[PDB]
Each structure stands twice: as C-alpha cells, then as structure tokens.
C-alpha cells in the first residue's frame, strides 16, 4: 500500500529518471529498497 | 506466524516434478489448522486443555492440514489432476 | 588551483588521460581505448591539498533549517534577507579538529543563506 | 481534557487506548525515528521560559 | 481577467443540521436496496470455499447490517421502516441500536484532516459542506481457516 | 444457525421486530433518558446527486477570510479541470467572490433556486493535481456520511468518488451562468433513484 501511494504521489521511479536528477532530489527507501526520488521531501513527510 | 507465515512458506515452496515418460506436479495449495486436540486409543475427539497437558505431560499442539493437487501427464498432454484435501 | 576533475571521451565516454605533444609541447587529453584526443586548458594534471583547507559552507545544505532538533538563535540575522532567526550547528566532519566552530543557516523559507562568524 | 474525560469512562463508553491512536494524539516511535524527534520530558518543558 | 463562461445546473441540496463523516468498521455493512422478503437476494457465497473466518464474518454481516423495508400499514399507507435507530441521550452521548446490538457512537473532531463534501455535476465538483466531526462505532460491551475437532486421530 | 436461506430471512425480519420495541431506558445508565429516537434510513432525497469526498493536502480557506465566512466560502467552492498550454490536465480550485455570496444569500432567503439572469462569479484560489478513485477502482473503501435531520431521522449517503488533491498566476474568473437540468442529467438522476428501489 505504501508503494502504491508513493507511485500515486509525485515520486519518480528509479528506471524512469535520468541520473542528473538524483543530485538535488531526495532518495526514498522502503524496507531498504531504493524505490525512487522526490523533489519536495518536507511535504511528503507531512503527508505520510 | 500462524496466520500469515505458514501459508507463505507453503506457497513459496516450489512444486515437485518427477520423471521416471510420466511426470507429476504435486502442488500444495491451502493450509487448515484445527484446535488443540487429544485422541486416546478409542480415537474419540476431545479438546486438550492446557492443564491436562501439564498434568499428563502432553504437548499442547494443533494439527496442520494442507490441500494437495496431484497431476500426472504421460502422453497426449492428458491431465490426471486429482486433489487430496485436508492432508 | 583546486582539484582537477576528469574528462570523458566524446566518442566512447571513457575517461581521458593526459598526454603531451612531443613535437608541439602541448598538453593533450587522449582516450586510451578509442583514439579520440583533445587539447587541455588547465595544464595542472594533479593536485593534492595536504592542509585540506576545504570550505564547510559549500557542503551545508539549506534544508537543515527544517530540522526540529537543531538550536535556533535570534541574535545573528542573515545578511542576504535580514531574517532574524537562524539554526546553528558544528561541522562534525572528520578532518575538523578545531571543529567547535558554529555555522548558521537562515530559517526563512526560500532564502537558505549559510554563513560563519 | 476531553480525551481524559472520555478515558475516565472507558468502562461504559468503551473509549479505549486505540481511540487515542486513531485520533492522532499518540504515536509509536521506533529508535531510528527517535533520532529525528525533539522530545519533551514533561509538558512543563513546553511552558514558555 | 480571462472570462470563462460556463453554464452549469444549480444543485439544490438539503444537508440538514449536522453532517458527520463515517468510516464503517469491518463488522458493519450497509445494504442500500430495500429489504423485501420476496426480492431479498442473499449472498449465498459458495458454501465450499468459505473458512471459519469467513463464516464468522458472514454471521456478523447478517445481524449487523442496516436495512430498511416498506411495510403496508393497516390503512394501506406505505410506511418506511428502518432496522436501525440512533438515540440521542440526555448526557449528549449517542448509541446505535441495531436490533438488539448496541454500538457506542463517539464524536471525534477531524483535527488535521480537510474532508470536504462535493457533488459531481457534469465535468466539475460542486462543494456542499466541510466534514468537521467523525463518528466511530464500537460494541457497547464485551458481553455483546480453523477446522472442527477431527473425529479420528492422525 | 444461519445455514438456510429461510433462516437468514427470519433473522433479518426479527431484527426489524426488535427495532420496533420502544426504547425507554438507557441500556447501561439508569438515570440517562432518551432525548430523541431517530430511525436510520438511506437518504432518499440526496441519493440522486453523486457525492464526492475531497481530501485537501492543505487548508483551502483563503488566508484573509477567517472564521465563519471561510467555511461558507469553502462550502460553495468549485473545482474545474484545466488543461495547461502543454496539455497537462490540472484542477483549478475556485472560491466564490463576496458579491456572489450576497447574491447566493438572496437566493436562499427568497427560496428561489437561482435568479435566471444572475451571473455568479468565482475567483480561482489554487490549482491542484487530482487523484480520482471511483467505486469501480480496485480497493475503493465505501465511505458514508450521516446527515442528522432533526425530527425526521438520520440519513446516510455514499461517497462514490474520492478525490485527493496534492498541491502542485492564472487570474482566471470562472463565470458561471445557471441553466435548467438537461434531459440527460435528469435521466442520470432517475438511474440513481432506482438504486434505492428493489430492482424487479
Ligand atoms: Zn574515447
Ligand atoms: Zn536569509
């Protein structure tokens, strides 16, 4: 359910992105799996 | 563990295929659990209460059953899929 | 001088190595699996900063102003926007012996000015 | 105060600990998350000073 | 000011006095069709595939479902009869009486959440009300995959 | 118990009979008297309209309008799908202007649905990205809201669609002119009314 919500939210999967975007974004780990990146970590944490 | 992990362990197990030609599948499907029970020589059922288990030095345990489906294929892709229930 | 990065071949995108023009006495960055070549401009192929005078302000990121566990002060307003509140903290990075120096970050959103005193 | 009032009568109204968690007034925090928490020992720490 | 002229129908609502957000627990279900014993379609889930867990869920679903039926009074007038009644008590607490089963109704302020009621009209949603309070139902008292004993050892 | 079809029907009929027993005393507290006993019925009036639950990430109330007026302003807000120049579909959140609220109050006091020749102006407040979940989407939990109509009963309605808005300079004025319901919308209202009727 959390992965579904994250995809549904503004998280970008790891195969979809270009490596240039990682630098300033927030990596997102779920149970130790790096599953994507997010550009607005603060409000994502608020939502969660 | 009882409610999720046993079923996951059973289902994650790879089905066993045997070659002597005839082949077999033997897939385990679903697990059932009874309540703790004791049978004497008569075989009449009775709930094993924990105090009786303490006094008679019994193990307080429940029997585990599983649904098994056996399929046999020899020629012409003829399926002999038979199901054994509550094994 | 500072650190000298690395270059990648335009064709195979492999690392370029430094070579000199024996005949012309010019520094070239030349691939080693393909045959691409390039003309250097820095002329400094290597650097080693023993004193390790590195700027901690470059590493600070403005997001730490959202950390609720950092102390906040109202006695060091930031120059860039004059906001009165900042978080402060120490470097806590190896290669920091006199590391009790404080660093400040403005807590006003969309300013994120880092400084030291 | 209303949460305390409802808990005082938990025998009758059936308002339980689970309702505190459901109303978002209490939270479970594990050690890693505790690393990021700013924790008051008592509500006296929230009083202005 | 770019003026976008849209012709939308006016929805006349009647939201009464109090609007409460309800998250139905797993043990309470709502059947929207009227109960007519002649037309009452039963679940009649395949006996076979149910487990003891499903049965307790089915039994709890039959008794704890809010239903309504149309009964003809003596004078032939169709009176809508509900199987559920909400009682406002003198102390301000609400209890839901479903048949003989009592569920305590807790009024909790939806603090933090912004639940709004909208109506879908054509290609847009029209706001109607903001949900302020959530109702939670609990059985008033504790007094409100298994298998049966195998007949022979194994 | 409830193995046979007939046994299930009798148990349900028994619940209706039990609900008709007059409630005079509190089940547990002897000194607590029932103030009002209201039967619970489906909302026969509002079921015709498709109700949606909209969850905002942040408070949609305009910063400057505090208190009682913000709730009235938010209760009449309009959300419309907008396509950006790049073809991306976003939802603009429109709030009524003060003038519209006065015109609307006149309509409510004068028991007139809408003044045919009145233009109700809405001003765009915020743009949102929309997630819509309908009854047909896998995992949609059916949520209800209860309406207490004093003296009549408690009416429950379903939230068929759940819209979650996550925060994404268009001074866009949504000019709404009210018209009468078209035949297709009325047919849709009858189809929804039929869900409350026992489908022969
Ligand atoms: Zn190369
Ligand atoms: Zn600043």
Swiss-Prot record, chain C:
Swiss-Prot/TrEMBL keywords: Acetylation, DNA-directed RNA polymerase, Metal-binding, Nucleus, Transcription, Zinc, Zinc-finger
Assembly: Component of the RNA polymerase II (Pol II) complex consisting of 12 subunits.
Gene field: POLR2I
Originating species: Sus scrofa
Protein name listed in UniProt: DNA-directed RNA polymerase II subunit RPB9
Positions contributing to Zn(2+) 2 binding: 78, 81, 106, 111
Keyword Zinc: yes
Gene Ontology biological-process annotations: maintenance of transcriptional fidelity during transcription elongation by RNA polymerase II; transcription by RNA polymerase II; transcription initiation at RNA polymerase II promoter; transcription-coupled nucleotide-excision repair
Main location: nucleus
Sequence positions that bind Zn(2+) 1: 9, 12, 31, 34
TFIIS-type zinc-finger residues: 74-116
Curated annotation (Swiss-Prot), chain E:
Transmembrane residue ranges: none
Distribution of this protein across tissues and organs: Highly expressed in skeletal muscle and heart. Weakly expressed in placenta and liver.
Location in the cell: Nucleus
Function, in words: Component of the PAF1 complex (PAF1C) which has multiple functions during transcription by RNA polymerase II and is implicated in regulation of development and maintenance of embryonic stem cell pluripotency. PAF1C associates with RNA polymerase II through interaction with POLR2A CTD non-phosphorylated and 'Ser-2'- and 'Ser-5'-phosphorylated forms and is involved in transcriptional elongation, acting both independently and synergistically with TCEA1 and in cooperation with the DSIF complex and HTATSF1. PAF1C is required for transcription of Hox and Wnt target genes.
Subunit field text: Component of the PAF1 complex, which consists of CDC73, PAF1, LEO1, CTR9, RTF1 and SKIC8. The PAF1 complex interacts with PHF5A. Interacts with TCEA1, SUPT5H and CTNNB1. Interacts with SETD5.
Family: Belongs to the LEO1 family.
Name of protein: RNA polymerase-associated protein LEO1
Species this protein is from: Homo sapiens
From Swiss-Prot, chain F:
Subcellular location: Nucleus
Chain intervals for the UniProt region annotation (Interaction with PINT87aa): 1-133
Bias (Basic and acidic residues): 186-199
Subunit structure: Component of the PAF1 complex, which consists of CDC73, PAF1, LEO1, CTR9, RTF1 and SKIC8. The PAF1 complex interacts with PHF5A. Interacts with POLR2A, TCEA1, SKIC3, KMT2A/MLL1, SUPT5H, RNF20 and RNF40. Interacts with UBE2E1. Interacts with PINT87aa which is encoded by the circular form of the long non-coding RNA LINC-PINT; the interaction enhances the binding of the PAF1 complex to target gene promoters and may anchor the complex on target gene promoters, sequentially pausing RNA polymerase II-induced mRNA elongation.
Family per record: Belongs to the PAF1 family.
Function noted in UniProt: Component of the PAF1 complex (PAF1C) which has multiple functions during transcription by RNA polymerase II and is implicated in regulation of development and maintenance of embryonic stem cell pluripotency. PAF1C associates with RNA polymerase II through interaction with POLR2A CTD non-phosphorylated and 'Ser-2'- and 'Ser-5'-phosphorylated forms and is involved in transcriptional elongation, acting both independently and synergistically with TCEA1 and in cooperation with the DSIF complex and HTATSF1. PAF1C is required for transcription of Hox and Wnt target genes.
Protein name according to UniProt: RNA polymerase II-associated factor 1 homolog
Gene this chain is encoded by: PAF1
Full-protein positions shown: 168 to 375 of 531
């Amino acid at each position: 359910p959390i992965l579904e919500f994250l995809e549904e939210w503004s998280m970008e999967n790891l195969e979809e992105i270009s490596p240039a975007a990682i630098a300033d974004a927030t990596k997102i780990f779920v149970n130790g799996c790096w599953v994507g990146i997010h550009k607005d970590p603060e409000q994502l944490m608020n939502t969660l | 563990f009882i409610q999720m992990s046993v079923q996951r362990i059973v289902e994650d197990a790879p089905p066993i295929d045997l070659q002597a030609p005839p082949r077999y599948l033997l897939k385990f499907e679903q697990i059932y659990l009874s309540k703790p029970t004791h049978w004497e020589r008569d075989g009449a059922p009775s709930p094993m209460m924990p105090n009786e288990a303490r006094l008679r030095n019994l193990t307080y345990s429940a029997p585990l059953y599983v649904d098994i489906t056996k399929t046999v294929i020899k020629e012409g892709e003829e399926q002999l899929q038979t199901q054994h229930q509550k094994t | 001088p500072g650190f000298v990065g690395i270059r990648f071949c335009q064709e195979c995108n492999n690392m370029l190595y430094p070579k000199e023009d024996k005949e012309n006495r010019i520094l070239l960055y030349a691939c080693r699996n393909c045959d691409y070549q390039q003309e250097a401009d820095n002329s400094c192929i290597y650097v080693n900063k023993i004193t390790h005078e590195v700027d901690e302000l470059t590493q600070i990121i403005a997001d730490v102003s959202q950390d609720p566990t950092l102390p906040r002060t109202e006695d060091h307003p930031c120059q860039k926007c004059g906001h009165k509140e900042a978080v402060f903290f120490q470097s806590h990075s190896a290669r920091a012996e006199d590391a009790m120096r404080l660093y400040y970050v403005c807590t006003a959103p969309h300013c994120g000015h880092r400084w030291t005193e | 105060k209303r949460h305390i009032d409802q808990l005082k009568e938990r025998e009758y109204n059936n308002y339980s600990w689970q309702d505190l968690v459901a109303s978002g007034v209490v939270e479970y925090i594990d050690t890693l998350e505790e690393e990021t928490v700013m924790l008051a020992m008592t509500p006296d720490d929230l009083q202005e000073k | 000011e770019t003026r976008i002229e849209v012709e939308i129908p006016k929805v006349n609502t009647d939201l009464g006095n109090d609007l409460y957000f309800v998250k139905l627990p797993n043990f309470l279900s709502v059947e929207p069709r009227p109960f007519d014993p002649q037309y009452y379609e039963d679940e009649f889930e395949d006996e076979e595939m149910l487990d003891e867990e499903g049965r307790t869920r089915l039994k709890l679903k039959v008794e704890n479902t809010i239903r309504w039926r149309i009964r003809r009074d003596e004078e032939g007038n169709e009176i809508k009869e509900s199987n559920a009644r909400i009682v406002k008590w003198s102390d301000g607490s609400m209890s839901l009486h479903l048949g003989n089963e009592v569920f305590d109704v807790y009024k909790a302020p939806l603090q933090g959440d912004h639940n709004h009621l909208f109506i879908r009209q054509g290609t847009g949603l029209q706001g109607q009300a903001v949900f302020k309070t959530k109702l939670t139902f609990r059985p008033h008292s504790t007094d409100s995959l298994s298998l049966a004993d195998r007949c022979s050892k194994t | 118990i409830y193995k046979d079809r007939d046994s299930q029907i009798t148990a349900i009929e028994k619940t209706f009979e039990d609900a008709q027993k007059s409630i005079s005393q509190h089940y547990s507290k002897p000194r607590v008297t029932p103030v009002e006993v209201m039967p619970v019925f489906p909302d026969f009036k509002m079921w015709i309209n498709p109700c949606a639950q909209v969850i905002f990430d942040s408070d949609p109330a305009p910063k400057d309008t505090s208190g009682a007026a913000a709730l009235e302003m938010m209760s009449q807000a309009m959300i419309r799908g907008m396509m950006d120049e790049e073809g991306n579909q976003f939802v603009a959140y429109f709030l009524p202007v003060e003038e519209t609220l006065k015109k609307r109050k006149r309509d409510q006091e004068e028991e007139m649905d809408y003044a045919p020749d009145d233009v109700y102006d809405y001003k765009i407040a915020r743009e949102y990205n929309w997630n819509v979940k309908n009854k047909a989407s896998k995992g949609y939990e059916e949520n209800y809201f209860f309406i207490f109509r004093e003296g009549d009963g408690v009416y429950y309605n379903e939230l068929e669609t759940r819209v979650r808005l996550s925060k994404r300079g268009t001074n866009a004025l949504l000019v709404v002119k009210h018209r009468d319901m078209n035949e297709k919308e009325l047919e849709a209202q009858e189809a929804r009314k039929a869900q409350l009727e026992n489908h022969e």
